[PDB]
Amino acid sequence: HSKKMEEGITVNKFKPKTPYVGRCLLNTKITGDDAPGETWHMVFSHEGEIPYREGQSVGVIPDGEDKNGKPHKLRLYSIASSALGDFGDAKSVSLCVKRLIYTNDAGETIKGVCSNFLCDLKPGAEVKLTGPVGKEMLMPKDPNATIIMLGTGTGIAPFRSFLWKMFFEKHDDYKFNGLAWLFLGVPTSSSLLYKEEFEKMKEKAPDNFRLDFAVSREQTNEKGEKMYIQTRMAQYAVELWEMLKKDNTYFYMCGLKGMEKGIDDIMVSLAAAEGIDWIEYKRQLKKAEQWNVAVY
Ligand SMILES: Cc1cc2nc3c(=O)[nH]c(=O)nc-3n(C[C@H](O)[C@H](O)[C@H](O)COP(=O)(O)OP(=O)(O)OC[C@H]3O[C@@H](n4cnc5c(N)ncnc54)[C@H](O)[C@@H]3O)c2cc1C
């Protein structure tokens, strides 16, 4: 029995040994120059060969071989477009990718393999894709569900997928009528991803969509604390905690592994205040399919 849209999903139609080869249509840098690090939105053609659903991921096998002459390991990217896609025809797939650049022990600059390959793609270049992968981040079946979404950085990707479906499309069997609430935590204003799209959805369904941004390096709460995502949530603590108590509420979290801890800290306190052990409560939520997490 699922509370999620699991029926008839496709998983691993394409595999590492037999990937689907698509072509890049567009590749755009979507963060401003200020932004610490670039993030690119890219669209690939798949001609309807990859029957994905909102919340799933695709694997990307970057070109080249590892130090042993073997093909690079695949990396997973949450799909950032809804099932019909950015063009409404179910033939393209979009990804949201941050370019990874760090320094090794010797002070030498290392670029992540897959992220730099993807961000460097030019229209017309081919790309090896696997999947779809995943069941954890699918949408609830309930069209009247209260859906709370908390992403950091690229974790915004599956929520864009959800929201395009909910608010930018007409479906014969699905009309969203609940409350969708998005919190997005980034470091700078030049790093707010898809703000413009979310701003248009808000105007469209003002009673069905709430939006909150947390720009850490540019916002502080009263104590003077940095505006991290949990720092922004705490401000709605009483409201969110009350929302968590209802059977039709669904929590999804996606982004950097770090975020998990700072929300747990906020939650352990709200629950204890009511005589509840957060660890056991979160466990029950996870089992009821209401606390969904994908951090990396
Ligand atoms: C379910 C899922 C969905 C994902 N969705 C997305 C998405 O939508 N967008 C996205 O950008 N990524 C996403 N990722 C992450 C993505 O899969 C890649 O890991 C990421 O793009 C970097 O891979 P790479 O090949 O560029 O790096 P690699 O070449 O594999 O390099 C990674 C390695 O770099 C090292 N490293 C990183 N930072 C440092 C540092 N500061 N100092 C030292 N060593 C360091 C780590 O040891 C790590 O093993 C997702 C991951 C998962 C599991």
How many distinct helices?
A: 7
Specify the oligomeric state.
monomer
The H/E string reads EEEEEEEHEEHEHEHHEHHE
Shape: globular
Number of domains: 2
User: How does the helix and strand content classify structurally?
Assistant: alpha/beta
Count the E strands. 13
Characterize the biggest β-sheet: 6 strands, antiparallel
Report the CATH architecture of the largest domain: 3-Layer(aba) Sandwich
Q: Order of strands across the biggest sheet? A: 4-3-8-1-2-5
Task: Assign the CATH superfamily of the largest domain.
Answer: Nucleotide-binding domain of ferredoxin-NADP reductase (FNR) module
Helix content: 10-25%
Which small molecules are bound?
Answer: flavin-adenine dinucleotide
Keywords: Chloroplast, Electron transport, FAD, Flavoprotein, Membrane, NADP, Oxidoreductase, Photosynthesis, Plastid, Thylakoid, Transit peptide, Transport
Pathway: Energy metabolism; photosynthesis
Enzyme class: oxidoreductase
Membrane topology: Peripheral membrane protein
Structural commentary:
It is a single chain. The chain has 296 residues and is α/β, with parallel strands linked by helices. It has two domains: 1-133, Translation factors (Elongation Factor Tu (Ef-tu), domain 3); 134-296, Rossmann fold. It contains seven helices and 13 strands. The strands form three sheets. A six-stranded antiparallel beta sheet has the order 4-3-8-1-2-5, with helices on one face. A five-stranded parallel beta sheet has the order 11-10-9-12-13, sandwiched between helices. The protein has a two-stranded antiparallel sheet with strand order 6-7. β9, α2 (157-168) and β10 (179-186) form a beta-alpha-beta unit. It is globular and about 55 Å long. It is a peripheral membrane protein. It comes from Spinacia oleracea. NADP(+) binds at residues 78, 98, 154, 186-187, 216-217, 226-228, 255-256, 294.
